[PDB]
Structures are given as structure tokens and as C-alpha cells.
């Protein structure tokens, strides 16, 4: 038994910036896509390189799995 991460995101027209308040994976999803990233580890991750007007979903999650639920945001133009 255990307390799983909390996170909040804001998309801006690139990046998006993820806040955890915290083996812990931030889950990037696109549509087919999904990239897993590694954060070093309350920080903030950015991910980048991303296209505008598209919709991401995040999840963030301790690996050993509980899936966070989504958080979704469309990128502005
Ligand atoms: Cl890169």
C-alpha cells in the first residue's frame, strides 16, 4: 500500500509543462504514439518539440504498475 504521484499540466504551442508532487515515468501520449519519459529525480518536467494544435495526454506513475488517470490538453496555435 502506498501513495501513487499527483501532477498537473499546462500546454503551451510546443511544450508542455508537467508539475509532480512526488522507477517514476512520465507517460507522453499522442494519437498511435506513446514515449516514455525519464525524469531525474515537488519538480517540473517540460516536454518539448511538440506540435501545435494537436491534443497530448500525460499519465504519471511509479514503475516496479498503476497508470495515473490522463490528464489531456490541446496545444494552442
Ligand atoms: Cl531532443
Do not use: R
Not at 499527483?6 to 507522453?28: P, Q, Y
Not at 499522442?30 to 525524469?39: F, T, Y
Amino acid at each position: 500500500s502506498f501513495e501513487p504521484p499527483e501532477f498537473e499540466i499546462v500546454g503551451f504551442t510546443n511544450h508542455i509543462n508537467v508539475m509532480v508532487k512526488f522507477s517514476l515515468v512520465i507517460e507522453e501520449q499522442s494519437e498511435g504514439i506513446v514515449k516514455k519519459h525519464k525524469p531525474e529525480i515537488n519538480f517540473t518536467y517540460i516536454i518539448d518539440k511538440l506540435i501545435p494544435n494537436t491534443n497530448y495526454c500525460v499519465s504519471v506513475y511509479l514503475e516496479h504498475v498503476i497508470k495515473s488517470p490522463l490528464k489531456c490538453t490541446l496545444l494552442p496555435p
